[PDB]
Amino acid sequence: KAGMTTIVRDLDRPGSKFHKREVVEAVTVVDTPPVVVVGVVGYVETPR
Amino acid sequence: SGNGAQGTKFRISLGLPVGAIMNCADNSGARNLYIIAVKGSGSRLNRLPAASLGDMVMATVKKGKPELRKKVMPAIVVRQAKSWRRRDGVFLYFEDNAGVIANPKGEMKGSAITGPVGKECADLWPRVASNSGVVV
Amino acid sequence: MATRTQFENSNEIGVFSKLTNTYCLVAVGGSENFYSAFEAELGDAIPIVHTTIAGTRIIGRMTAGNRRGLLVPTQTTDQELQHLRNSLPDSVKIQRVEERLSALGNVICCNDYVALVHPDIDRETEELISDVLGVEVFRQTISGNILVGSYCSLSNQGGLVHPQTSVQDQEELSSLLQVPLVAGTVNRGSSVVGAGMVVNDYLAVTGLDTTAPELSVIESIFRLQDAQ
Amino acid sequence: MGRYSVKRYKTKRRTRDLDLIYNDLSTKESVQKLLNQPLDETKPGLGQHYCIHCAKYMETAIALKTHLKGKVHKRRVKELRGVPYTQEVSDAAAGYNLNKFLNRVQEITQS
Amino acid sequence: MRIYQCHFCSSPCYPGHGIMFVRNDAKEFRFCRSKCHKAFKQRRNPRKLKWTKAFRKAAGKELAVDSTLTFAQRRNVPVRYNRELVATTLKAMARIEEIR
Amino acid sequence: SQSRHVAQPQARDDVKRTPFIPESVKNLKKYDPEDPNRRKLARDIEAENGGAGVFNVNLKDKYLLEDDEWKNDIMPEILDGKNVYDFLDPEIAAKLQALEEEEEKLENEGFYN
Amino acid sequence: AREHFEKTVAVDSVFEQNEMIDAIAVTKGHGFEGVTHRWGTKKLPRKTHRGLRKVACIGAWHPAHVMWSVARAGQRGYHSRTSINHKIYRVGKGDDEANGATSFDRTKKTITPMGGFVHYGEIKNDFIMVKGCIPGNRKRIVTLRKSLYTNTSRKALEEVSLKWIDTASKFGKGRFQTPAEKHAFMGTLKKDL
Amino acid sequence: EHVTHPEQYIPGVLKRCQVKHLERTYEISGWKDATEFIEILARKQGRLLKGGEPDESGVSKQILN
Numbered sequence A: 001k002a003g004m005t006t007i008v009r010d011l012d013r014p015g016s017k018f019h020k021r022e023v024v025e026a027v028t029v030v031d032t033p034p035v036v037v038v039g040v041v042g043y044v045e046t047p048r
Numbered sequence B: 001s002g003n004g005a006q007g008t009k010f011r012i013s014l015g016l017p018v019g020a021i022m023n024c025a026d027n028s029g030a031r032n033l034y035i036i037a038v039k040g041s042g043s044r045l046n047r048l049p050a051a052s053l054g055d056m057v058m059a060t061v062k063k064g065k066p067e068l069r070k071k072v073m074p075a076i077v078v079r080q081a082k083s084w085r086r087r088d089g090v091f092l093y094f095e096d097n098a099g100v101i102a103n104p105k106g107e108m109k110g111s112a113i114t115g116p117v118g119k120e121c122a123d124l125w126p127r128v129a130s131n132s133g134v135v136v
Numbered sequence C: 001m002a003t004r005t006q007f008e009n010s011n012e013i014g015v016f017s018k019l020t021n022t023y024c025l026v027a028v029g030g031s032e033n034f035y036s037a038f039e040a041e042l043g044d045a046i047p048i049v050h051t052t053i054a055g056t057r058i059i060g061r062m063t064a065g066n067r068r069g070l071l072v073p074t075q076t077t078d079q080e081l082q083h084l085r086n087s088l089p090d091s092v093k094i095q096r097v098e099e100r101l102s103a104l105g106n107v108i109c110c111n112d113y114v115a116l117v118h119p120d121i122d123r124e125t126e127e128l129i130s131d132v133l134g135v136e137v138f139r140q141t142i143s144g145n146i147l148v149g150s151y152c153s154l155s156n157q158g159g160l161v162h163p164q165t166s167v168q169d170q171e172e173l174s175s176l177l178q179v180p181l182v183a184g185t186v187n188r189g190s191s192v193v194g195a196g197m198v199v200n201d202y203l204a205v206t207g208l209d210t211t212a213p214e215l216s217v218i219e220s221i222f223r224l225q226d227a228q
Numbered sequence D: 001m002g003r004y005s006v007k008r009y010k011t012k013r014r015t016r017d018l019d020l021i022y023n024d025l026s027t028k029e030s031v032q033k034l035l036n037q038p039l040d041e042t043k044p045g046l047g048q049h050y051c052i053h054c055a056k057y058m059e060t061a062i063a064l065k066t067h068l069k070g071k072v073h074k075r076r077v078k079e080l081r082g083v084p085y086t087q088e089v090s091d092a093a094a095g096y097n098l099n100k101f102l103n104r105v106q107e108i109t110q111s
Numbered sequence E: 001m002r003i004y005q006c007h008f009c010s011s012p013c014y015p016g017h018g019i020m021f022v023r024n025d026a027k028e029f030r031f032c033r034s035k036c037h038k039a040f041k042q043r044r045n046p047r048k049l050k051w052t053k054a055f056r057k058a059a060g061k062e063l064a065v066d067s068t069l070t071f072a073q074r075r076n077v078p079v080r081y082n083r084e085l086v087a088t089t090l091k092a093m094a095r096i097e098e099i100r
Numbered sequence F: 001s002q003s004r005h006v007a008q009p010q011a012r013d014d015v016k017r018t019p020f021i022p023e024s025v026k027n028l029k030k031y032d033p034e035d036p037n038r039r040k041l042a043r044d045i046e047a048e049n050g051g052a053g054v055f056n057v058n059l060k061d062k063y064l065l066e067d068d069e070w071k072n073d074i075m076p077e078i079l080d081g082k083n084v085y086d087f088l089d090p091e092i093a094a095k096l097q098a099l100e101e102e103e104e105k106l107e108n109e110g111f112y113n
Numbered sequence G: 001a002r003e004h005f006e007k008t009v010a011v012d013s014v015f016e017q018n019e020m021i022d023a024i025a026v027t028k029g030h031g032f033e034g035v036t037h038r039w040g041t042k043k044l045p046r047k048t049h050r051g052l053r054k055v056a057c058i059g060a061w062h063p064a065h066v067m068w069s070v071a072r073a074g075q076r077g078y079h080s081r082t083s084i085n086h087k088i089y090r091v092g093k094g095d096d097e098a099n100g101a102t103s104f105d106r107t108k109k110t111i112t113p114m115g116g117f118v119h120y121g122e123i124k125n126d127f128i129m130v131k132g133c134i135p136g137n138r139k140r141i142v143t144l145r146k147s148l149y150t151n152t153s154r155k156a157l158e159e160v161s162l163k164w165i166d167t168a169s170k171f172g173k174g175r176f177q178t179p180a181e182k183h184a185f186m187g188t189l190k191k192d193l
Numbered sequence H: 001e002h003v004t005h006p007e008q009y010i011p012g013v014l015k016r017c018q019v020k021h022l023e024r025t026y027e028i029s030g031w032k033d034a035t036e037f038i039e040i041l042a043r044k045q046g047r048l049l050k051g052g053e054p055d056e057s058g059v060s061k062q063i064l065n
Helices: B119-124 C033-042 C078-087 C123-132 C167-177 C212-221 D004-008 D018-026 D028-035 D061-067 D071-078 D087-092 D098-110 E034-041 E053-059 E083-099 F042-047 F092-109 G179-186 H010-016 H019-025 H034-045 H056-064
Strands: A003-011 A021-031 B021-024 B030-038 B056-064 B072-077 B084-086 B090-094 B098-101 B113-117 B132-135 C002-005 C017-019 C024-027 C048-051 C064-066 C069-073 C093-097 C108-110 C114-117 C136-139 C152-154 C159-161 C181-183 C197-199 C204-207 E019-022 E028-031 G020-026 G029-033 G074-077 G080-092 G127-131 G143-146 G162-165
Touching: A003 G127, A021 G080, B021 B056, B030 B072, B030 B098, B056 B098, B113 B119, B119 B132, C002 C033, C002 C212, C017 C033, C017 C197, C024 C033, C033 C048, C033 C204, C033 F042, C048 C078, C064 C108, C069 C078, C069 C123, C078 C093, C093 C123, C108 C152, C114 C123, C114 C167, C123 C136, C152 C197, C159 C167, C159 C212, C167 C181, C181 C212, C204 C212, D018 D028, D087 D098, D087 E053, E019 E034, E028 E034, E083 F092, G020 G127, G080 G162, H010 H019, H010 H034, H010 H056, H034 H056
Parallel strands: B021 B098, B090 E019, B113 B132, C002 C204, C024 C048, C069 C093, C114 C136, C159 C181
Antiparallel strands: A003 A021, A003 G162, A021 G127, B021 B030, B030 B056, B056 B072, B072 B098, B084 B090, C017 C024, C064 C069, C108 C114, C152 C159, C197 C204, E019 E028, G020 G080, G020 G143, G029 G074, G080 G127
16 A cells, blocks of 8 residues: 545536536555566365 | 436435524525425434435525425535545535525526535436536 | 427526527537427527526526527536537527626526626626627616516517516506517416416427416417417 | 634624625716715714725714724725736636636726 | 735636635635635735745745746746647646746 | 406517517427427437436437537546636637747847846 | 467457446454444443443343344454456557557557556556446455356446546645646746756 | 514504604604614614624514513
């Protein structure tokens, strides 16, 4: 989680009161560099 | 929402609790209104019913024309001193919090409104938008 | 050719729509039923434009205009103003007015030829009405009612004023407008007639709850029925 | 933020702004309206004795005459001589509607 | 959306920033930040506060009358859309910022 | 009961005031909801695309341009902190070129020595 | 998986824009915090003996115990939470400059605010911008999950059309989107001649 | 004291009492109406609230007492 910032969004929500109207939204920016696979785990399905 | 309200109303910050004097924007002869109740308010235990722009209240005319006082008529808040949010993000407020006398079906007792009227209230009440010379 | 319609179950047609001779503005909201109820009576003959004015659905009371041009309040965003320009052909001037009485629909009651305005609108705005809309302007009240646009529905044929309009005030306003004036109601006894309906020379749309005598007087004074 | 500024400059206690007062002073009709005013049971002195610049009411002709000799009245008068600070001024200062600012200043200076 | 300018210090008030005050005259007062809003509520003159752009223009700290500063005005009468016109507008703005 | 009127305009000036009805209106077919071939209203497109609240109306496909290929193109709002709409102006090339002439004159006159 | 044992997986190979995702993270920690704000219990009247920021009566004559349900003071925050249905507003690309630019805003800027984020550096990498707030504070590992069900709200279907991203500074009342804009608004300083 | 709008009962007092006596109990004269009888009395007695307006309800309470 990097932080938050402000977004203007051109809202296309038919049936809404903000339909076809720009709306300012708060958003969260998550820094996501690529993750690299290093292993496998196999799960069996047991009565416990 | 209420009777005569056009469509839904979104959240805006509540400015006017019960017991709040608010100006009379219309020309019905009242000079200020005293909120005794708020339509639509939920039942939280110690929470005072509070009113905001575009909300219909029940108000007594406390000062003004004696033909209007000692009576409890519905009112519709048209201005507000508490800063609320507009979705095209801006927090705004008016210099005074004011309302207009309306019959419970939405019609204005007065024939005009003086001073600005918030667009959240003009949009919600067609008879307010139709009696307001200044919107936003 | 008076028609009954309700924008999302409201008889105030003139709040949610603007109608002139050569275009029609209808608010954005919910479905297309209001738009289509204008389109049935107009088709593609004149442009029917969905629009919002400052995001509100009250475009009829916010904007003022006739077949020659359209005025929009200073609160209308650049996107909405561009939308109105893109939608309407160049024969219709569009102007954003830097004027206090932003609800131009309430404040200006005009047809193609003459306009009535709030008695205290700015001189610059009077001049801009005279230039853009191409009308001669009069500061008047509809029997003491300053919001002339809401209390007077007007076309080139005739005009309808709010029922408490005095007889000599009807006469004086008819002289100014050069149309016959009558004082009646719309939407079953509403005195706010400008908000209660939209009208031009060949169409009038009123709220669904208009009484039949009220349509009779509307179609008389506004000369809707063909070959009257 | 403190105590005094929040006590004095609430939107409850907000007084008349300077450009509005400038426009009140602009024409002879508005000023002659503001001086010869209708009686008003709520306003001090029943609405007579108005100081146009300060936009506040005095209780009597003595309190108005004493008001016109005080540094508060001088401070308000000095604040109003030039060109009122409107949104024209805050717009042109960033390169925006600069032409209307300029010719507004010319109109104010010539009238 | 658009950038408004702070009624006090002429700074850009982007969407979601500052607050606005509306008088009984429908005159909106945008403010970039609570600093300018509070200085306005306190009736402080922005032309005597040195950190405002109004002071710097009035005193001559920055250039006021120029050809580059006339191009940005509030366009009341709109124009129809045109990709060539708007692309020339974007190129124009890139040129005007450099020259100014 | 003695206790229980259209005002006419005595002419003020000789200006021709006449009603306007455009030709495309007068040439129009009156609507008939009983045709198989009547005009397709907006509800009809709305009905076959999802319903009242689901039909996302494209406001763009009905406005009038010099080219339908830029019917759906996005007009930019912001660039480097400037309102594009407020710099937007017909004949912007004319003012820009006058600015360029004045500026290269300032250069050749020696303004940034 | 065998084919992937040292290859990376980019974030756009898992999520994409206009998708609702779940955010699973341990919330921000607040330490030992009392009932008045750990549970929202009303403050007792002013200058109540033994204090006013505490729950007043704890029990009846029976069950002769404090129940588990009575609100008591203790640790607030740092709890594990699963917050679901966060609409993805942008899946950014690290190499792509103008991360923070859109088709309405042509400024050619990345989503990194001026001065970077506060208590977190730049965004040099791929990023996920989700609508609204997320459990956990900044710097914190979060797990983003695909939605456990095919959501039937119309929000889960909408295409998101950003007009603008606020890249102004979060370290103050930031008024500029780029250092270039700040410089062009200020003018030249005394550091410059 | 608990009468919420005691300004309305004052025309009742003017009905019961006589003007000849009421001009004398309070040294005031020439009221056209009760609603202004209160205000002329209050200005006479200095029962003006902060801001120049008469303490109209309180003077009405005193008149009823």
